[PDB]
């Protein structure tokens, strides 16, 4: 139902034979032109290998207050703002996730050291109780 | 201009009350899809984590 | 790792100031814009005829599709809950 | 949203990578189990070739609405494509109006000289007769 | 090179077999979907008679300029506003030409009725002349 | 902008209405005079089937301009495709690292319980050996 690059609702879906997943024809062709392999599996894939699908011709209802002015002025501007700020927020979250991964790996190594110390403490305490 | 602008704006309000229910209905359905699409991916977290 | 689109988008975001849109059509040099409003109001009055011709049938025809697409998601949610629960049950024993 | 084989609403969608037309996992599985082919085009197919429908990636989508810039570009393209034929509707009719206008003006220009000749002849005959 | 419907450069052209005309698939499709005929020849044609043409080399993408996109939006708006007026002037002139054709036809109808009285006067003149 | 017979730039581009792929009048006419068939698909084709001199007409041709009508929209489409393609790879890494974050936090609290138990184990062993 969806495209597996653009997160859209494809109008001409094409599926790959090496990794069976529906992609939009435009993004899949651009991906094949960039580097000749599948995006998902990174397996050998060409434009000729792709097999176009046929579908329900899926429809969008243009709003009742649709004109050249509202389409040109307000709609495209809303689309560009929703693109820019969303990409910016995603970049910020990516930086934060890297920082949190760093803090998690450090805390994990610290736990490993503490456990290694208690392994030497507890077992010798047990031997000393056995003594 | 003002004659036809009054015509289509009146033509919109026949459909803006007609589709306006389905607009908030389709808006309500899309909010539920976006509600599940977080928890569906939240299922993807708790699968490979567990 | 993108084309110049990335540079213009980041400049427009850091800059934040959204690109100038079409503020010519609505106001109406003025004769051409006026005839444009005429043709556009005619196109708009034609585009509202083909909407009312079908009307509320086309909206519910996609609304049924909306509910049908909705159901599969909760079905897969049930599948996922069940698989995680079986895993936790095995770990419990 | 539907299954092409059964025509019922699939609650377990699986799309095959040969002749994709969203099919029921249960029904397509049996169709492959009876014979190793795709139901529509009769091309070779396995159950491993099939893949159930899944969320594309962690890129989050939004519903297809009028807001979408792609739907806006498609709508602008359709609008221009309607205006193009709107232009032909008037240019072609002008091409007949102009031919009729040329023919009617040529008939008027061919008739008016003879009408002036009639306006000459009637008064010349009257001045001839009244003089005698 | 130019489809004989939209004037646009065909990206998926198809030729009509009843009348030799390379048109645009979508425009010809809508024309046949309204009425089953050819727009040029008015001959009976269907969708299945259409023969999809291939023109792979001709495609030339417009590299408008380095020019910023904020100006490109106003470019598209200006062109749409100009196309609307070019469509307005192309219809008012047709209506005026049809009106002028009828206005010439009315005199074309009056002239031959004046000619009847002229011929009657000529017969009267000869009828007096023979006597 | 090349003929499909000579590979020369056609000055009078004609197309045969069976397997149309623009050629030039001279080469196509000579190929028809040799044998009345199309060189591309070898189908039946005649001289009268060929459509000749270009069609500049009711159209008022606009040589491909920079900033006029549609190239801005095609460019917006090409840029939005890029925005979505970049969002794909960005969200991929976001979620793929989030999975590691979740597994790491889980294993961190799990191993925390290991020391929590071991500490009291040593603590009991200390008083055990101390009392003896």
From Swiss-Prot, chain B:
It comes from the Eukaryota. Signal peptide: none annotated. Phosphorylated on serine and threonine residues. Has no effect on subcellular location nor on homodimerization. Phosphorylated in vitro by CDK2. Phosphorylation enhances interaction with PPP1R8. Ubiquitously expressed in both fetal and adult tissues. It is found in: Nucleus; Nucleus speckle; Cytoplasm. DNA-binding protein involved in cell cycle control. May act as a transcription activator. Plays a role in pre-mRNA splicing as core component of precatalytic, catalytic and postcatalytic spliceosomal complexes. Component of the PRP19-CDC5L complex that forms an integral part of the spliceosome and is required for activating pre-mRNA splicing. The PRP19-CDC5L complex may also play a role in the response to DNA damage (DDR). As a component of the minor spliceosome, involved in the splicing of U12-type introns in pre-mRNAs. It is linked to A chromosomal aberration involving CDC5L is found in multicystic renal dysplasia. Translocation t(6;19)(p21;q13.1) with USF2. Homodimer. Interacts with DAPK3. Component of the precatalytic, catalytic and postcatalytic spliceosome complexes. Part of a spliceosomal 'core' complex consisting of CDC5L, PLRG1, SPF27, CCAP1, CCAP3 and CCAP6. Interacts with PLRG1, Lodestar/TTF2, and NIPP1/PPP1R8. Component of the minor spliceosome, which splices U12-type introns. Within this complex, interacts with SCNM1. Component of the PRP19-CDC5L splicing complex composed of a core complex comprising a homotetramer of PRPF19, CDC5L, PLRG1 and BCAS2, and at least three less stably associated proteins CTNNBL1, CWC15 and HSPA8. Belongs to the CEF1 family. This is Cell division cycle 5-like protein. It comes from Homo sapiens. The gene is CDC5L.
Swiss-Prot record, chain C:
It is found in: Nucleus; Nucleus, Nucleolus. Ubiquitously expressed. Belongs to the SPF27 family. Component of the pre-catalytic and catalytic spliceosome complexes. Component of the postcatalytic spliceosome P complex. Component of the PRP19-CDC5L splicing complex composed of a core complex comprising a homotetramer of PRPF19, CDC5L, PLRG1 and BCAS2, and at least three less stably associated proteins CTNNBL1, CWC15 and HSPA8. Interacts directly in the complex with PRPF19, CDC5L and PLRG1. Required for pre-mRNA splicing as component of the activated spliceosome. Component of the PRP19-CDC5L complex that forms an integral part of the spliceosome and is required for activating pre-mRNA splicing. May have a scaffolding role in the spliceosome assembly as it contacts all other components of the core complex. The PRP19-CDC5L complex may also play a role in the response to DNA damage (DDR). This is Pre-mRNA-splicing factor SPF27. The lineage of its organism: Eukaryota, Metazoa, Chordata, Craniata, Vertebrata. The chain holds residues 63 to 169 of 225 of the full protein.
Curated annotation (Swiss-Prot), chains D, F:
It is found in: Nucleus; Nucleus, Nucleoplasm; Cytoplasm, Cytoskeleton, Spindle; Cytoplasm. Ubiquitous. Weakly expressed in senescent cells of different tissue origins. Highly expressed in tumor cell lines. Transmembrane segments: none annotated. The modification N6-acetyllysine is found at residue 120. Induction: By gamma irradiation and chemical mutagens but not by UV irradiation. Residues 1-71 form the U-box domain. Homotetramer. Component of activated, catalytic and post-catalytic spliceosomes. Component of the Prp19 complex/PRP19C/Nineteen complex/NTC and related complexes described as PRP19-CDC5L splicing complex and PSO4 complex. A homotetramer of PRPF19, CDC5L, PLRG1 and BCAS2 constitute the core of those complexes. The interaction with CDC5L, PLRG1 and BCAS2 is direct within this core complex. At least three less stably associated proteins CTNNBL1, CWC15 and HSPA8 are found in the Prp19 complex. Belongs to the WD repeat PRP19 family. The 7 WD repeats are necessary and sufficient to support interaction with the RPA complex. Ubiquitin-protein ligase which is a core component of several complexes mainly involved pre-mRNA splicing and DNA repair. Required for pre-mRNA splicing as component of the spliceosome. Core component of the PRP19C/Prp19 complex/NTC/Nineteen complex which is part of the spliceosome and participates in its assembly, its remodeling and is required for its activity. During assembly of the spliceosome, mediates 'Lys-63'-linked polyubiquitination of the U4 spliceosomal protein PRPF3. This is Pre-mRNA-processing factor 19. The lineage of its organism: Eukaryota, Metazoa, Chordata, Craniata, Vertebrata. The chain holds residues 3 to 134 of 504 of the full protein.
């Amino acid at each position: 139902l969806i495209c597996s690059i653009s997160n859209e609702v494809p109008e001409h879906p094409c599926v790959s034979p090496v990794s069976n997943h529906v992609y939009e024809r435009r993004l899949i062709e651009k991906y094949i032109a960039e580097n000749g392999t599948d995006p998902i599996n990174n397996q050998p894939l060409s434009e000729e290998q792709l097999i176009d699908i046929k579908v329900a011709h899926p429809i969008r209802p243009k709003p009742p207050s649709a004109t050249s002015i509202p389409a040109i002025l307000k709609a495209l501007q809303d689309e560009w703002d929703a693109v820019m700020l969303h990409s910016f927020t995603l970049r910020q979250q990516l930086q934060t996730t890297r920082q949190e991964l760093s803090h998690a790996l450090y805390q994990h190594d610290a736990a490993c050291r503490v456990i290694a110390r208690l392994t030497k403490e507890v077992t010798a305490a047990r031997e000393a109780l056995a003594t | 201009m003002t004659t036809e602008a009054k015509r289509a704006a009146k033509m919109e309000k026949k459909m803006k009350i007609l589709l306006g229910g389905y607009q908030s209905r389709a808006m309500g359905l899309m909010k539920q899809l976006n509600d599940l699409w977080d928890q569906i991916e939240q299922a993807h977290l708790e699968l490979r984590t567990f | 790792t993108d084309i110049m689109r990335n540079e213009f988008e980041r400049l427009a975001a850091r800059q934040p100031i959204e690109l100038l849109s079409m503020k010519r059509y609505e106001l109406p040099e003025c004769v051409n814009n006026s005839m444009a409003q005429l043709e556009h109001q005619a196109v708009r009055i034609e585009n509202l005829e083909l909407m009312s011709q079908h009307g509320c049938n086309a909206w519910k025809v996609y609304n049924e599709n909306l509910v049908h697409m909705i159901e599969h998601a909760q079905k897969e949610l049930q599948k996922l809950r069940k698989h995680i629960q079986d895993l936790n049950w095995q770990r419990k024993n």
